[PDB]
Design a protein around this ligand. Structure first.
Ligand SMILES: CCCCCCCCCCCCCCCCCC(=O)OC[C@H](COP(=O)([O-])OCC[N+](C)(C)C)OC(=O)CCCCCCCCCCCCCCCCC
Ligand SMILES: CCCCCCCCCCCCCCCCCC(=O)OC[C@H](COP(=O)([O-])OCC[N+](C)(C)C)OC(=O)CCCCCCCCCCCCCCCCC
Ligand SMILES: CCCCCCCCCCCCCCCCCC(=O)OC[C@H](COP(=O)([O-])OCC[N+](C)(C)C)OC(=O)CCCCCCCCCCCCCCCCC
Ligand SMILES: CCCCCCCCCCCCCCCCCC(=O)OC[C@H](COP(=O)(O)OCCN)OC(=O)CCCCCCCCCCCCCCCCC
Ligand SMILES: CCCCCCCCCCCCCCCCCC(=O)OC[C@H](COP(=O)(O)OCCN)OC(=O)CCCCCCCCCCCCCCCCC
Ligand SMILES: CCCCCCCCCCCCCCCCCC(=O)OC[C@H](COP(=O)(O)OCCN)OC(=O)CCCCCCCCCCCCCCCCC
Ligand SMILES: CCCCCCCCCCCCCCCCCC(=O)OC[C@H](COP(=O)(O)OCCN)OC(=O)CCCCCCCCCCCCCCCCC
Ligand SMILES: CCCCCCCCCCC1=C(C)C(=O)C(OC)=C(OC)C1=O
Ligand code: SF4
Ligand code: SF4
Ligand code: SF4
Lengths: 176, 312, 80, 110, 97, 360, 156, 70
């Protein structure tokens, strides 16, 4: 249930002594190292051609956030603030009021993408699949406040990526 | 006309040093299961040009130098000695055909440590000075086995003439009578140019130089690398020379020197670094006793075989 | 002389190869039959001019022409 | 004469490249840099071992200077004397190395 | 000889990009000249290619359009130029284009 | 050249993690543990999960326990690749870094397939794992494991018999057994010094008594035996991963106590009790009965422990995090005496030190 | 004009050489260092873009702040930043370097590295992937591509 | 793959082929279509300066054979 690494007492017959001395004087293990490096010289490398080739992702991937809509145009967020109670970073700021037809809807849905730890507790705490953490990861900005999303930016990410987000949720929701 | 010959020596040295950096990054890339540079040029060929233009317009690092004069002279001396190590090299005819080209090269390579020493003292950092003293002691250490191995091999040549060393090897490569001298020579020239696994300047002296002069030290070091591979090629792997077609020798020694420079690139992507005492142990307690023993063997061996080479 | 030699070849083979190569370099020219030919080739290499002698009247072994039979010969150097 | 022209050309090319490296990026009008090391300000401690390996280099390089006429000395007619003195010089270099060994001179830079 | 098969694959890569002009076009825009089955094209001009004999990661790629939403993208290719319907397929979230 | 004293100054990544844990619930404080030993993410998840499940007096289902052991050994492969390749990269062997980070890249693809993030998964939770293994994942884990021994073999061909790698590691950083136990060392730091101790054998957790593996024991206490222990632990992790793939049971992946683990999303949208429990677990969180545990697991650096104090509420009252790297970097000063300055980078390498768990 | 064409072509030349030869000094602060080490790994391979792996901080062209910046190390970050030769750029990688992140309300964390150094590219994630960091590096290259140093110098 | 390093090696090999080819063609052009006279020793210099005097054009390489004797 255990083994002894490096507890080999070497042989002292003239065969093994001359083998070790030929290894010392003729550099056998150094040529073994050169052979392994030469072996990787003639291998096809593992380099994908980014941006033209992309690294493989799964439908569970947790990237850029997006507020979704029902298949009628109505937004799914019913202002229940579970995503900001569960948020380990307190990145989500929510303020709500009844809108002009009496629906429980948010007026403030902020996510600070520089507080966010991208762990997806908001999409798994959301009872109506409103906030999701979509598949976009290429959204680097040049300014800090461009990573401070309001409700307009998140609903635009939903409208921008819904054709992908709905298919990822369709592929994954029986594991959830 | 001779000035044209000096230009056709020294400008292609600079071009081959420029593209050796690309060959290093590519060969180290593919040996590391990745690619080297292939975006900046077609197959990466514009990477050294882009990098040279980048370094020459980067801000000067502006150090407080101890001596201004030696801070200027250390790149000057490094580049001048890096270029003058090529002029006795027979390929198949040298620029300066001299009777003592071997001893000239050993002398001008012995002078190369002053650039390291002056760059180390001309910086105000004591850490850079300690690193320079370590690098100078390393280089002057391995120059001992350079001199003695080189003498022992030239006991089969008859002279210090580098052009005679091609005539010496018309029946056999000189690595076949002298492969232990060849392998200790090869590791010793690997330790001359502060090259891995002997690069303790990268393991935790010219760090106070700006991007321009540091690039000049870097290109002088790679000119020394290409030159010592060409000198090892002429010294142990002497090609066939047809006097009516010299380009046969030129193509042949070029292929052998490229393989030997790639062998430097292939050593540096294969081994970890020595500790400083470990390569001191490698010189003084391993290479130098065998070097002295083989020097006795190559003194006494042309006498016991009646194979003393001609003086002329 | 037997266990000591295997011990030093097991621990320090670089030094054993050093003293072995140096010992062969010392002893082997005294035992080689070709050591004499090194001497005989080095003394037969004419760096200077063979300044001729005045024929006084009695020198039977000195030639008058280089292609004469008498004199030093180097057929051993051509044949070996 | 060709060699002096070659040395002057190499020194002139090196000085031209060094002048371009020290004066072309000086024309950048970037910014003045306010307030431009493992040891802070302590003096450099003298290492006895670095001086020892330098003097050992110097002495063995002198023994190399004695060994350098050997490709010419093999051409002599007094070959027994020449061979004896050549093996004696390389043997005295080896005795210098063995004494440097056994009196702990090759230590911590072995 | 199998070296001649290698040279024939290189020459049919030169042939398969529509000649030397298209070969150099994909060489300087893509740093890659290997030919692939055109899986599709979006409403911008991004051409999406397969080669299932390449290894996983190389087996799908995009040659980006030279103009998208008014910006000349002949040299300024961008990873965010992929529309979301091809972003599943190219990132291998599914097998289906 | 010698080293007379080594004073490591740390706190350069002290973020006050375990004070931030005191103001967040147990689920909310779970992703702080991914960020401590940031190359051993799911192992620290498992240690915190076992601490909370010990205080909650509940247990994971068997399939969740086998998933935790499978991904703990994948995590151990990740961490020992990081250990060996950066310890070689600092000495100068820079090439097996690039050779093994493709294998490490493929294991991050495994993490991303199973959780959605490549590093900080938040996948092993108190109660089980968050989500079940997607289809075709275990087949690809088998396809990884079928090839990975050859990668270890060519790593070991580049380093182990190399005389330069031996000279930098064989006489370097010798730790005796009594001073290893006295400095609070754990893992390979003990096992390189001859000490036959492994927490997966002695104080076993989830299903480690049902896997068969060996424990590599060094003989000299140096950098080289600890290197050989880490390489052989990659071998034995491949052995445990084969046993986990062959003995994976069917079933659920969370505990079926819906007052601890949240219900499925289909039944939360159908049942009243499930919606109430979903609400109260994702807003308040489950209450934990009051008590102090010290739950320690065998993380790939050593004994990773959590002294978790619950006051009876839905947030931790106290959560002390014992890291192996803290005691190892404390023992750095004894381990480097009489050595040279270039030996110290080998000694800092052979203690697998990641400063997130050192500093918290 | 003619000189406007000359400064346009010289801006194109020097911006080409500066974006095609970026040398990064990466602060390996925290978990984002692991993902930078994956952006140097064979799959993504920064070196094929001319982006070398671990240049020294006095010859580097861009400082990648990859991890959490604490109060104890913020003067060391500012020291390394001040010691960089110009043109120097700052990529902020990950949430803690961007805005404090998961340690934003901590007593010992600088709430974003932009309180310390001027930041050019903010790369979001925890950690952002090696592909996302490579996206940020290529966006930095595009930012260098549209620099107008000599055109504004000619128009001043 | 591994043949991607070969353009850089080809450029570097042409850059090493240039100096030897150039000095060979210059030694043929500057010496009357022949090799440069190697005069390492003073006898070789004596013969070379005798050639310079017997050519009549102040050039060592312009050779004079049996046409110069009667
Ligand atoms: C042979 C190997 C390669 C050699 C080097 C590369 C070849 C090209 C060399 C010339 C490149 C252009 C000049 C150097 C780069 C200047 C970049 C720069 O910072 O510009 C702003 C600088 C200064 O612009 P500035 O006045 O706006 O200052 C910027 C800094 N502030 C605002 C804070 C004060 O421009 C110059 O210095 C212009 C110098 C002349 C440019 C060329 C003129 C025509 C030459 C033909
Ligand atoms: C010119 C073309 C290339 C030439 C060949 C070189 C290419 C191969 C390069 C491989 C990569 C090398 C990377 C750097 C390695 C540096 C470390 C190293 O190798 O150290 C050297 C090692 C150092 O020893 P060591 O450290 O391995 O061993 C331990 C040593 N002690 C015990 C002292 C600690 O070995 C040598 O020094 C050997 C040098 C060459 C020996 C040549 C012997 C020839 C045979 C003589 C005769 C023997 C029989 C007896 C007499 C018989 C008479 C009939
Ligand atoms: C310790 C001594 C080692 C060398 C011993 C002499 C070796 C030798 O061949 O000497 C002949 C050589 C030269 O003799 P030779 O045989 O070459 O003489 C032929 C004449 N010439 C030189 C013109 C060609 O030296 C001598 O004969 C005298 C000098 C050395 C005498 C011994 C000195 C010992 C000092 C001990 C203190
Ligand atoms: C001894 C031999 C030594 C050899 C050393 C050099 C080896 C490599 C040689 C070069 C190989 C080919 C290089 C091609 C570079 C890329 C050129 C290119 O495509 O540039 C495009 C760019 C923009 O053009 P644009 O009109 O905008 O394109 C839009 C099209 N609708 O337009 C531009 O950028 C403008 C044009 C720039 C042209 C630069 C060409 C490269 C110069 C390199 C220096 C060496 C020259 C060769 C020396 C040896 C041969 C004499
Ligand atoms: C700090 C200052 C600046 C530092 C940077 C620059 C200086 C350092 C780098 C340059 C070093 C220059 C070395 C000059 C002499 C080299 C030795 C030499 O000339 O050897 C070659 C040759 C001997 O071969 P041989 O064949 O015998 O001669 C032909 C006759 N058969 O001999 C000949 O062919 C002889 C030819 C005629 C005599 C030539 C004399 C040259 C000028 C004097 C030396 C110049 C250097 C002075 C400063 C050196 C500083 C280290
Ligand atoms: C007569 C021939 C010419 C001799 C002079 C020329 C020599 C040429 C080579 C130059 C040698 C220079 C250096 C010599 C140093 C000798 C002292 C020495 O090294 O002793 C120490 C060594 C044990 O090494 P240690 O001190 O432990 O090193 C620390 C790392 N472990 O101790 C040892 O390893 C034991 C060394 C002594 C025994 C060696 C026996 C070799 C026998 C080979 C076969 C016979 C060859 C004929 C000549 C025999 C001469 C004794
Ligand atoms: C009077 C008017 C003229 C004034 C003086 C200027 C003289 C000519 C100077 C060189 C040419 C200037 C134009 C520079 C390029 C402008 C166009 C450009 O940026 O093209 C981009 C293209 C690559 O596109 P990229 O954005 O990199 O895309 C990423 C991959 N999709 O880029 C490419 O395809 C490659 C671009 C290469 C640039 C030219 C080659 C390098 C410079 C060579 C000459 C200078 C250096 C000489 C030797 C120095 C020492 C070795
Ligand atoms: C004008 C002639 C060339 C001048 C020298 C600049 C180009 C060669 C050196 C540049 C360089 C390259 C390419 C390089 O790749 C590199 O990284 C390994 C360097 O830094 C250590 C360099 O200095
Ligand atoms: S996004 Fe979901 S969890 Fe958040 S307030 Fe809206 S409905 Fe509730
Ligand atoms: S992914 Fe996590 S940290 Fe980010 S907004 Fe959602 S719950 Fe908050
Ligand atoms: S942003 Fe997050 S994952 Fe990245 S270094 Fe910070 S704590 Fe680690």
């Amino acid at each position: 249930t255990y083994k002894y690494v490096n507890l080999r007492e070497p042989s002292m017959d003239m065969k093994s002594v001359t083998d070790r001395a030929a290894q010392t004087l003729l550099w056998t293990e150094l040529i073994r190292g050169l052979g392994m490096t030469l072996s990787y010289l003639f291998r096809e490398p593992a380099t994908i051609n980014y941006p033209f080739e992309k690294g493989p992702l799964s439908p569970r991937f947790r990237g850029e956030h997006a507020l979704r809509r029902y298949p009628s145009g109505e937004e799914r967020c019913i202002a229940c603030k579970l995503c900001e109670a569960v948020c380990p970073a307190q990145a989500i700021t929510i303020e709500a009021e009844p809108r002009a037809d009496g629906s429980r809807r948010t007026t403030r849905y902020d996510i600070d993408m520089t507080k966010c730890i991208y762990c997806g507790f908001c999409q798994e705490a959301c009872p109506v699949d409103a906030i999701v953490e979509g598949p976009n990861f290429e959204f680097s900005t040049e300014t800090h406040e461009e990573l401070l999303y309001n409700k307009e930016k998140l609903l635009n990410n939903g409208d921008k990526w819904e054709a992908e987000i709905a298919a990822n949720i369709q592929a994954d929701y029986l594991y959830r | 006309m001779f000035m044209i010959n000096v230009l056709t020596l020294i400008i292609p040295i600079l071009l081959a040093v420029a593209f050796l950096t690309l060959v290093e990054r590519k060969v180290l890339g593919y040996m590391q299961f990745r690619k080297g540079p292939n975006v900046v040029g077609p197959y990466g060929l514009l990477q050294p040009i882009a990098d040279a233009i980048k370094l020459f317009i980067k801000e000067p690092l502006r150090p407080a130098t101890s001596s201004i004069s030696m801070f200027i002279l250390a790149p000057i001396l490094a580049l001048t000695l890096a270029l003058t190590m090529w002029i006795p090299l027979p390929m198949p005819y040298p620029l300066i055909n001299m009777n003592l080209g071997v001893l000239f090269m050993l002398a001008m390579s012995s002078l190369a440590v002053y650039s390291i020493l002056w760059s180390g003292w001309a910086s105000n950092s004591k850490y850079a000075l300690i690193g320079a003293l370590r690098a100078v002691a390393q280089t002057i250490s391995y120059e001992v086995t350079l001199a003695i191995i080189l003498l022992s091999v030239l006991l089969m040549n008859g002279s210090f003439t580098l052009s005679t060393l091609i005539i010496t090897q018309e029946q056999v490569w000189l690595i076949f009578p002298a492969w232990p001298l060849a392998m200790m020579w090869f590791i010793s020239t690997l330790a001359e140019t502060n090259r891995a696994p002997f690069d303790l300047t990268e393991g935790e002296f010219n760090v106070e130089y700006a991007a321009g002069p540091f690039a000049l030290f870097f290109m002088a070091e790679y000119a020394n690398i290409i030159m010592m591979n060409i000198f090892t090629t002429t010294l142990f792997l002497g090609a066939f020379h047809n006097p009516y077609m010299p380009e046969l020798y030129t193509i042949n020694f070029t292929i052998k020197s490229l393989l030997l420079s790639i062998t430097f690139l292939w050593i540096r992507a294969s081994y970890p670094r020595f500790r400083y005492d470990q390569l001191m142990h490698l010189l003084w307690k391993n290479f130098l006793p065998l070097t002295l023993a083989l020097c006795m063997w190559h003194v006494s061996l042309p006498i016991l075989l009646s194979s003393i080479p001609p003086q002329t | 002389v037997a266990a000591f030699l295997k011990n030093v070849w097991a621990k320090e083979p670089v030094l054993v190869a050093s003293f072995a190569i140096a010992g062969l370099a010392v002893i082997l020219p005294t035992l080689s039959p070709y050591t004499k030919y090194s001497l005989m080739i080095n003394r037969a290499t004419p760096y200077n001019y063979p300044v001729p002698l005045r024929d006084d009247g009695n020198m039977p072994d000195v030639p008058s022409h280089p292609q004469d039979p008498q004199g030093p010969s180097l057929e051993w150097l051509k044949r070996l | 004469m060709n060699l002096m022209i070659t040395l002057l050309t190499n020194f002139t090319l090196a000085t031209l490249l060094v002048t371009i490296a020290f004066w072309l990026p000086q024309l950048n009008v970037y910014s003045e840099k306010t307030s431009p090391d493992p040891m802070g300000s302590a003096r450099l401690p003298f290492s006895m071992k670095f001086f020892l390996v330098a003097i050992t280099f110097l002495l063995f390089d002198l023994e190399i200077a004695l060994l350098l006429p050997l490709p010419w000395a093999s051409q002599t007619t007094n070959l027994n004397t020449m061979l004896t003195m050549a093996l004696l010089l390389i043997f005295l270099l080896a005795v210098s190395l063995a004494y440097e060994w056994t009196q702990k001179g090759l230590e911590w830079t072995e | 000889m199998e070296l001649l098969q290698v040279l024939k694959r290189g020459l049919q890569q030169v042939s398969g990009h529509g000649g030397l002009r298209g070969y150099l076009r994909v060489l300087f825009r893509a740093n890659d000249v290997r030919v692939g089955t055109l899986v599709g094209e979006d409403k911008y001009g991004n051409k999406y290619y397969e080669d299932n004999k390449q290894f996983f990661g190389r087996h799908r790629w995009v040659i980006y359009t030279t103009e998208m939403n008014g910006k000349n993208t002949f040299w300024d290719v961008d990873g965010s130029m992929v529309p979301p319907e091809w972003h599943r397929w190219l990132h291998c979230m599914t097998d289906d284009p | 050249e010698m080293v007379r004293k080594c004073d490591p100054h740390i706190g350069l990544l002290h973020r006050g993690t375990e004070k931030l844990i005191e103001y967040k619930t147990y689920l909310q404080a779970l992703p702080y543990f991914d960020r401590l030993d940031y190359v051993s993410m799911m192992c620290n998840e498992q240690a915190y999960s076992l601490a909370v499940e010990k205080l909650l007096n509940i247990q994971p289902p068997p399939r969740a326990q086998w998933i935790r052991v499978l991904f703990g050994e994948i995590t151990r492969l990740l961490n020992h690749i990081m250990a060996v390749t950066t310890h070689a990269l600092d000495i100068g062997a820079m090439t097996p870094f690039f050779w093994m980070f493709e294998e490490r890249e493929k294991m991050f693809e495994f993490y991303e397939r199973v959780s959605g993030a490549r590093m900080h998964a938040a996948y092993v939770r108190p109660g089980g794992v968050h989500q079940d293994l997607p289809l075709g994942l275990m087949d690809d884990i088998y396809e990884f494991s079928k090839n990975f021994s050859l990668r270890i073999d060519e790593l070991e061909e580049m380093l182990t018999n190399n005389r330069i790698w031996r000279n930098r590691t064989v006489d370097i950083g010798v730790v005796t057994a009594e001073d290893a136990l006295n400095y609070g060392f754990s893992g390979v730091m003990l096992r390189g010094s001859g000490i036959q101790w492994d927490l997966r054998k002695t104080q076993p957790y989830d299903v480690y008594d049902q896997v068969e593996f060996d424990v590599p024991i060094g003989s000299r206490g140096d950098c080289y035996d600890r290197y050989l222990c880490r390489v052989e632990e990659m071998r034995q992790s491949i052995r445990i991963i084969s046993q986990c793939l062959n003995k994976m049971p069917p079933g659920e992946i969370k505990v079926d106590d819906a007052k601890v683990s949240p219900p499925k999303r289909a039944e939360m949208k159908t049942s009243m009790e499930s919606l109430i429990h979903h609400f109260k677990l994702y807003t308040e969180g489950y209450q934990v009965p009051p008590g102090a545990t010290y739950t320690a697991i065998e993380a790939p650096k050593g004994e990773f422990g959590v002294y978790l104090v619950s006051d009876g509420s839905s947030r931790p009252y106290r959560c002390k995090i014992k890291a192996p790297g803290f005691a190892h970097l404390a023992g750095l000063d004894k381990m480097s005496k009489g050595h040279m300055l270039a030996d110290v980078v080998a000694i800092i390498g052979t203690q697998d030190i990641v400063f997130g768990e050192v500093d918290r | 004009s003619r000189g406007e064409y000359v400064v346009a072509k010289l801006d194109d030349l020097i911006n080409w050489a500066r974006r095609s030869s970026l040398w990064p000094m990466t602060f390996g602060l925290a978990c984002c260092a692991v993902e930078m080490m994956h952006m140097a790994a064979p799959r993504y391979d920064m070196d094929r873009f001319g982006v070398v792996f671990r240049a020294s901080p006095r010859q580097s062209d861009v400082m990648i702040v990859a991890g959490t910046l604490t109060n104890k190390m913020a003067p060391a970050l500012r020291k390394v930043y001040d010691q960089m030769p110009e043109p120097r750029y700052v990529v902020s990688m990950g949430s803690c370097a961007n805005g404090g992140g998961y340690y934003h309300y901590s007593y010992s964390v600088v709430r974003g590295c932009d309180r310390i150094v001027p930041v050019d590219i903010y790369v979001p994630g925890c950690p952002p992937t090696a592909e996302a960091l490579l996206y940020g590096i290529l966006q930095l290259q595009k930012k260098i591509k549209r620099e107008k140093r000599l055109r504004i110098w000619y128009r001043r | 793959m591994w043949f991607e390093v070969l353009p850089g090696i080809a450029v570097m090999g042409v850059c090493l082929f240039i100096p030897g080819m150039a000095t060979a063609r210059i030694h043929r052009f500057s010496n009357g279509g022949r090799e440069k006279r190697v005069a390492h020793y003073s006898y070789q210099w004596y013969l070379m300066e005798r050639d310079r005097r017997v050519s009549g054009v102040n050039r060592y390489y312009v050779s004079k054979g049996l046409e110069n004797i009667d």
